[PDB]
């Protein structure tokens, strides 16, 4: 490509990962960068070619429509655009749930396997004190700490 | 996550619809104002006019241009009425 | 055939199973592949044959679809494409309930063996100790430590 | 810009943050400012230029609306009303039962934690005291204090 940009370093970074991770599925990975003016002067001057500026609509006919006599009417963009924030704010909330349902299953995971560390630590420390004794009283007449720490141990 | 995508695309398709509706009732309006607007012209034409073979030749000249965009059951024998 | 390239060894790499696994039913087994061409050149030149450069449609009556005066209608492909896309992440989603599911049995599975193995060391280790003092104190007129290894001994 | 006032100290302690923290939503983070006009004045005077001093409607048609003979219907402003009402207070709802959700989460956690901490100090007591005897009795034959205090001590 003639105007490669910095794109390149950026696909990169994406790599391949799906929807997920913190960010409500996807965090602000990115930074904040300034605003390109301060002034619109019309978009981007002759790149632009926009009517910011120049529409200055304020009308409800455009907003809300509008029907002349004789039939013949026509719509706003009221209602396609609650239509499509209708759309956005129900495909978050389905991620939303998603991502909770996943929380909730990790969380649960997390305490099971938690507690099942502090028991076999618990369990550890008592054969080990328990074959303190052993290890002892005779020594010659009975096995070693490393036999049983590498033989009878739990995992 | 992807379940309510559903509800989403569908929300975003029926818009096209209700618009696509409005565009045929618009254009049906349409063809009715065609229509009329022919029909004003010979409507509005004196008897030596349209008795003289050269106006009426044009006249219905304009009717062959339009072609299924104006009634074509209204607009025949409207001469002769 | 005329033409095998190297579909076969795809084939026999693919074998017959079915979906599951880890990949929301089926992973990116295969590698990412570089474009043949940077420039579209019209598709694949003579054997694409198509209008990428040359239709340049950009006419809502395309997208969206549009209607004469004397009826006549012709639909868009959008309403198609919406359709396509409905159903596609419908089947996503049933797949993805389905693998969530299995994933819950299969953590249920795990917990409970884990926890039957966990007690099994500790039986067995409580056993084998008991049985120190058995074959310590009178060894003629008690047992062996093989006997009751291989006899009472917990699976 | 030409009147900066003082909305950029606002704007910077508002920083980023979502909905959220324990106002419904966001809390009386502000506060309860002084009214700006002794009497109505018609509103700010000049700057305001308002007719609602003056208006006085007291009419059923413009809250109810009305239609006059031969059709010619307008609707009054209490349904829009009612529907926005209905709107705000929906959205307000189902913020209160997310918030509820994400209470109760937190709770168990907060449970599970808690209940975790007071059996690891129980347990890290129960071994002090079991080790006391020991490093008590034989200082010299048995291990010191610190090798369990970091080898053997619960997490």
């Known amino acids: 490509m003639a105007y490669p940009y910095s794109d390149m370093p950026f696909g990169v970074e994406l790599d391949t990962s799906t929807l997920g991770s913190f960010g409500l599925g996807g965090p602000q990975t990115q930074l904040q960068m300034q605003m390109p003016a301060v002034d619109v002067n019309a978009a981007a001057s002759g790149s632009g070619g926009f009517m910011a500026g120049f529409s200055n609509i304020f009308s409800r006919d455009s907003m809300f429509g509008g ?80 036999s049983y720490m590498e033989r009878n141990r739990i995992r | 996550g992807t379940t309510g995508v559903q509800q989403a695309l569908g929300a975003l398709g029926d818009i096209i619809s209700r ?45 062959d241009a339009m072609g299924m965009n104006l009634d074509r059951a209204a607009t025949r024998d409207a001469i002769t009425k």
Chains 1, 3, 4 share one sequence.
């Open chain 1, 67 to 146: 029907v002349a006599p004789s039939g013949a009417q026509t719509g706003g963009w009221v209602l396609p655009a609650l239509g499509i924030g209708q759309a956005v704010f129900g495909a978050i909330g389905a991620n939303r749930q998603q991502r909770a349902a996943r929380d909730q299953l990790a969380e649960s995971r997390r305490q099971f396997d938690m507690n099942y560390g502090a028991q076999r630590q618990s369990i550890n420390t008592n054969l080990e004190d328990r074959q303190r004794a052993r290890v002892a009283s005779n020594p010659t007449a009975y096995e070693s700490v490393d």
């Open chain 2, 19 to 63: 618009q696509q509706e409005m565009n045929v009732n618009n254009a049906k309006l349409q063809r009715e104002a065609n229509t009329q607007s022919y029909l004003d012209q010979v409507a509005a034409s004196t008897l030596e006019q349209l008795s003289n073979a050269d106006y009426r030749s044009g006249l219905e000249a304009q009717r």
